């Protein structure tokens, strides 16, 4: 008889001095907040029930009311930032951290969920939860020989809460906290459950989004092989975070990019650059562009894996954002590549699609394309072959696009097009 209660009855029951009346009222409140039709969180907050739930969180003798209040506060902290702030202002962080060590698995799981919802609000509440000392109990909950002995849902919730503790920036998670969490996160990254894998991979992608110091921190744990293995997975929820993490890693030093390459990541890109999902193609092309901005030996490893034809294909037909990432990749290739590599580019058939891409409203893509065409023309000069390249660019209908860009609102575009016209077409 706790279904479809009024906030008035719940308030009257909780305000009584009868622990059982309070328990039934809190259960009614939980059921009201556990509905799928927009829970009445604001009504429960305006009634002043959060402090009473926070107090119930500490009644060890009555574990049912602890569980009910934890569920209710978890659902309240799942809403807007203001509702999570109301939960935190009730003093719920320390109460949930204390319940993390409860002998009842369901109560501890609800505490993990509540702390995860709180930390997911932003950097401020995340760092506050970390200051209150939640990392040590959370990791102690996972300190077991084999993770497979834990319940699937419990482990998934723990993984999600940790990933939220690794999330958000400005500021990024504390360095000590990341060092304390990484071992368990890597242990979870090798688990067999797809949801745990996806969440731990998202956490790793979070930790690798930043300065090269954090990327080095993550890479020192030896996760690049596992990340590449997950990159070749069949489930998109696992491939997406893996690709994001690989991309973040290759945005760092050339040595970290080489660590990625040595793990065999390039061998997976033939299918990533042809993935039916647009986001996968876009982020794979972005990763390829960051790889082509590396050393010449890395460009040569890209060439050896036969990925230049796939970039040509992406430039020929793909979403405009993927095509722009491919143009950036080609520009970096030509800017850092050897003459033989810049010639292999044309031998693969880049000129025609790269020229067809010049007839776009986006100005930055035009600047990138014209820089790439300047670099290729310089590579041709270096072999006394500019004339044949010019005839090629004029045959495919590009010269018309180059001379049309001589009039353009942006200045650098028309300046570069005029330079090219007067320097290689006379």
């Amino acid at each position: 008889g706790t279904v479809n209660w009024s906030v008035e009855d719940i308030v009257k029951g909780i305000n009584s001095n009868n622990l059982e009346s309070q328990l039934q009222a809190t259960q009614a409140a939980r059921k009201l907040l556990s509905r799928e039709k927009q829970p009445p969180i604001d009504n429960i907050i305006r009634a002043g029930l959060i402090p009473k739930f926070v107090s119930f969180l500490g009644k060890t003798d009555c574990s049912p009311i602890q569980f009910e209040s934890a569920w209710a506060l978890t659902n309240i902290a799942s809403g807007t930032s203001e509702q999570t702030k109301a939960v935190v202002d009730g003093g719920a962080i320390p109460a949930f951290i204390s319940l993390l060590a409860s002998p009842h698995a369901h109560i501890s799981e609800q505490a993990v969920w509540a702390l995860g919802n709180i930390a997911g609000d932003g950097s401020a509440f995340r760092d506050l939860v970390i200051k209150h000392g939640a990392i040590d109990p959370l990791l102690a909950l996972l300190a077991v020989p084999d993770l497979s002995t834990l319940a699937c849902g419990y482990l998934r919730n723990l993984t999600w809460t940790l990933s939220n503790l690794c999330r958000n920036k400005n500021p990024a998670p504390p360095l000590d906290a990341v060092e304390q969490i990484l071992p368990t996160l890597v242990r979870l990254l090798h688990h067999n459950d797809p949801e745990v894998l996806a969440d731990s991979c998202w956490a790793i992608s979070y930790l690798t989004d930043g300065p090269n110091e954090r990327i080095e921190m993550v890479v020192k744990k030896g996760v690049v092989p596992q990340l590449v293995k997950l990159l070749g997975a069949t489930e998109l929820p696992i491939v997406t975070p893996a690709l994001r993490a690989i991309g973040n890693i290759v945005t760092g030093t050339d040595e970290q990019t080489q660590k990625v390459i040595d793990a065999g990541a390039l061998a997976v890109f033939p299918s990533l650059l042809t993935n039916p999902k647009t986001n996968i193609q876009k982020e794979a092309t972005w990763t390829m562009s960051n790889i082509t901005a590396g050393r010449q030996d890395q460009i040569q490893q890209v060439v050896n894996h036969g990925l230049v034809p796939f970039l040509v294909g992406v430039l020929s037909k793909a979403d405009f954002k993927t095509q722009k990432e491919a143009a950036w990749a080609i520009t970096n290739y030509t800017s850092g590549g050897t003459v033989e590599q810049i010639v292999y580019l044309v031998h693969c058939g880049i000129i025609e699609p790269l020229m067809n891409l010049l007839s776009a409203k986006d100005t930055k893509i035009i600047q990138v394309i014209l820089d790439a065409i300047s670099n290729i023309f310089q590579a041709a000069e270096k072999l006394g072959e500019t004339e044949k390249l010019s005839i090629m660019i004029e045959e495919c209908g590009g010269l018309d696009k180059i001379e049309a860009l001589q009039r353009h609102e942006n200045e650098s575009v028309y300046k570069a097009s005029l330079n090219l016209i007067e320097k290689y077409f006379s």
Partner: peptide
Amino acid sequence: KKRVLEKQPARKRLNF
């Protein structure tokens, strides 16, 4: 030069 970009897990979850 290395550039930056521009299925994620729920930031907050409601039990049931």
